DNA sequence: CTTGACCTTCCCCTTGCTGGAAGGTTTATAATGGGAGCTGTCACGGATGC
DNA sequence: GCATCCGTGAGTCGAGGGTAATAAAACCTTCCAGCAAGGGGAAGGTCAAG
RNA sequence: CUCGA
């Protein structure tokens, strides 16, 4: 294997019903081998060297960021407006797209 | 004062004063707590005795009864110049036939010059 | 949560703290007090008695002291204890003056020059001494609470009473208890192993109670000089893993070398002077370098090599590291012998012992179903041909001697040990025939000689090559 | 068949040591927490632990 | 009770090659062998007459 | 480990 990223799915296998389930490995040449996955309930995990699973955050916590940070890092904000007592939000169109 | 520390002062081995010890000769030295032989000047003058005494040419029992008249305080000295003399008296014994050794083997080695013959002189003799 | 014992052992020791350098001040403080109170309370005792005695009588006949000192500090101790021995017995034990010569006996008495095989010499023997008296009240305690059934609560009344006469022995039965009225059958017991404890009273010359708390004192000094030796082996327990870091070249595990290195740290800690102004790990390294290269020279290998033909190993291994980088290539052992200055036969015997064993299981190709122990012939076996033709020879045997008649038949198989137990000697074999020594030899010479003959000896030409 | 005379090998012994083997005991500036090895199989049965 | 975690399996028979690495030092003790030429003796084996 | 059925 040639060293690098890689992502590999599995076809079926682990649970029923399909949901294929993405991971991602990190392969160096001489190190530990940084792991992601996911779950059948979404969620994402990582296993450093083919140890126990662990929640995928908490290598984000370790490289100083707050919770806050970590929201602005991987999302995308809808700001919302109160004036005169209204609940009027902003709207792009290309964020409301098909629901 | 250990018995390396005795090797330097008189100069025998360090196997040999344990052979002396072994032997019937010197005055068996104290231990120290431990298995450690420790020597006081009483050894120290009857081991530089028995050096010498090897080296002017008794033998071990005669130097064996030597320390012991070293060793009491009366050492009644007639008997003394008669191991001496009787010392002195072997020495003469031994040299005189030494000599006769050098006198017969002498007179035989007159002739064998030494060139590439096959006959010796001296190989037929005793043959 | 956890399986390797390293992290257990290093997880159990990380709950000590580090030692300051007063703190090993402190500890040893702690211990020359534990050992002192042992030191001062012996002095009222006639072991120590016995043991002026030897060491005052041992220099008699006789830093490194002057011998001048220990002619003055063996020497008035003999009168002291002279005018104090004869003065207990005077109108008291235990007196205004004769507790004050006690103290006397007591006080002059340190003399110490220390020897700890001559210290404990001493504890060695009150400890059977007061084993003694203690296996003589344990006793009187079998024999009255469980077989003559007397309660502890009117036992203790009168066993604390005296212990020296027979008054607590009939004096407490005017109370009847009558299982312990049963004594008629059962006194033949106490009172004549009372007179144990009275041999022992005539011994020490001591009463009871007056021996008792000699031995509390012991014990509480003991105790004292054990719990101030095991904060010190306790917090030292990182410098014996930092030592064992390097020994771990592959004859022992990891963990033996941190045991063995302990035992270096609790003789180090015995032996270790803090008059010196020395730091504790100045002494204790040695003695735990010396404990590893001890054990690692001892076990950790199979075919168990001396202690002294490891320096012999080491010394040519040495040497043949030093050759390769000076001269570059591999050294023969003539000119390794020229830098050893040995004989060259002698640095061929130690290259030959080295080379510890073959595991058995090992795969002898890249493979992991051919092992070597699948490949080693056994080579005690008698061969089946080889055990054919050993009884075709017997049978043969069996067979030719039959022509032979009465005598000779018998003197022959007896002589070379056919269908005996054993071989006869010559006169084994001449006293069971007759006497004779000679006429069984010429018996066996006519036997050969007819053996020999072309008539018989056809068959047993093939069995010869 | 019997007696003494001779043979064999083998074990112990004679001085004045010396060489070697196997075992035990210390040494005082200061040193205070390991590291090697594993990741590219699949399919169960069945303990186990909230 | 049920998701999850751990243990145990995974064809047979023949060839050939193999069978490796590196780690103190001064002191003390007892015991055994050997060596310069034989001497001595003890437990077995033969010889030549009678 | 490579090879043969």
Not at chain 1, 86 to 97: G, N
Not at chain 2, 18 to 24: H, L, P, V
Not at chain 3, 80 to 95: C, E, P
Not at chain 3, 424 to 449: H, N, P, S
Request: aromatic fraction near 6%.
């Amino acid at each position: 294997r040639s060293p690098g990223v890689f992502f590999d799915s599995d076809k079926g296998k682990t649970h029923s019903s399909g949901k294929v389930l993405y991971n991602a490995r990190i392969i160096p040449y001489r190190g530990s081998w940084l792991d992601f996955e996911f779950d059948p309930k979404d969620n994402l995990f990582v296993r450093i060297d083919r140890r126990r699973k662990l929640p995928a955050t908490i290598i984000l916590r370790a490289l100083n960021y707050t919770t806050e940070q970590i929201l602005d890092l991987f999302f995308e904000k809808v700001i919302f407006e109160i004036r005169d007592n209204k609940l009027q939000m902003e709207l792009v169109p290309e964020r409301l797209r098909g629901e | 004062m250990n018995i390396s520390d005795v090797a330097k002062i008189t100069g025998l081995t360090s196997k040999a004063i344990r052979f002396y010890e072994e032997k019937g000769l010197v005055t068996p030295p104290m231990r120290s707590e431990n298995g450690y032989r420790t020597y006081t000047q009483q050894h120290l003058n009857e081991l530089t005795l028995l050096r010498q005494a090897r080296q002017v040419g008794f033998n071990l029992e005669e130097s064996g009864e030597l320390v012991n008249l070293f060793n009491d305080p009366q050492r009644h000295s007639a008997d003394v110049k008669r191991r001496t003399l009787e010392k002195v008296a072997e020495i003469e014994r031994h040299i005189e036939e030494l000599q006769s050794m050098r006198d017969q083997l002498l007179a035989l080695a007159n002739a064998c010059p030494g060139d590439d013959s096959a006959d010796c002189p001296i190989i037929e003799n005793l043959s | 949560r956890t399986t390797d014992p390293v992290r257990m052992y290093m997880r159990e020791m990380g709950t000590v703290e580090l030692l300051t350098r007063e703190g090993e001040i402190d500890i040893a403080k702690r211990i020359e007090d534990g050992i002192n109170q042992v030191q001062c309370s012996v002095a009222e005792y006639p072991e120590a008695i016995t043991y002026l005695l030897e060491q005052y009588d041992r220099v008699e006949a006789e830093n490194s002291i002057d011998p001048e000192l220990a002619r003055e500090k063996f020497a008035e101790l003999r009168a002291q204890y002279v005018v104090t021995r004869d003065t207990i017995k005077a109108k008291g034990r235990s007196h205004a003056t004769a507790q004050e010569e006690i103290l006397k006996l007591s006080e002059v008495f340190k003399q110490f020059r220390l020897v700890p095989k001559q210290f404990d010499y001493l504890v060695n023997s009150m400890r059977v001494m007061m084993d003694r008296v203690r296996t003589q009240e344990r006793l009187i305690m079998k024999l009255c609470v469980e077989q003559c059934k007397m309660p502890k609560k009117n036992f203790i009344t009168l066993f604390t009473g005296n212990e020296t006469s027979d008054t607590w022995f009939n004096a407490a039965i005017a109370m009847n208890k009558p299982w312990s009225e049963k004594l008629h059958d059962v006194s033949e017991e106490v009172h004549r192993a009372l007179q144990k404890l009275q041999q022992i009273e005539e011994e020490t010359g001591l009463t009871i109670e007056q021996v008792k708390d000699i031995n509390r004192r012991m014990s509480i000094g003991e105790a004292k000089a054990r719990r101030a030796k095991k904060e010190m082996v306790e917090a030292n327990l990182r410098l014996v893993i930092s030592i064992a870091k390097k020994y771990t070249n592959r004859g022992l595990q990891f963990l033996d070398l941190i045991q063995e290195g302990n035992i270096g740290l609790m003789k180090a800690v015995d032996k270790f002077e803090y008059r010196r102004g020395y730091k504790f790990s100045t002494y204790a390294t040695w003695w735990i370098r010396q404990a590893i290269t001890r054990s690692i020279a001892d076990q950790a290998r199979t075919i168990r090599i001396p202690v002294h033909m490891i320096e012999t190993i080491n010394k040519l291994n040495r040497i043949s590291r030093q050759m390769l980088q000076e001269m570059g290539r591999e050294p023969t052992p003539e000119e390794l012998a020229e830098r050893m200055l040995m004989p060259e036969d002698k640095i061929r015997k130690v290259l030959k012992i080295a080379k510890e064993p073959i595991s058995m299981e090992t795969p002898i190709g890249d493979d992991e179903d051919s092992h070597l122990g699948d490949f080693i012939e056994d080579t005690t076996l008698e061969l089946p041909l080889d055990s054919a033709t050993t009884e075709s020879l017997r049978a043969a045997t069996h067979d030719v001697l039959a022509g032979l008649t009465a005598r000779e038949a018998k003197v022959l198989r007896m002589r070379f040990g056919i269908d005996m137990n054993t071989d006869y000697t010559l006169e084994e074999v001449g006293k069971q025939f007759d006497v004779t020594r000679e006429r069984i030899r010429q018996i066996e010479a006519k036997a050969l000689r007819k053996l020999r003959h072309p008539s018989r000896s056809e068959v047993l030409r093939s069995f010869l090559d």
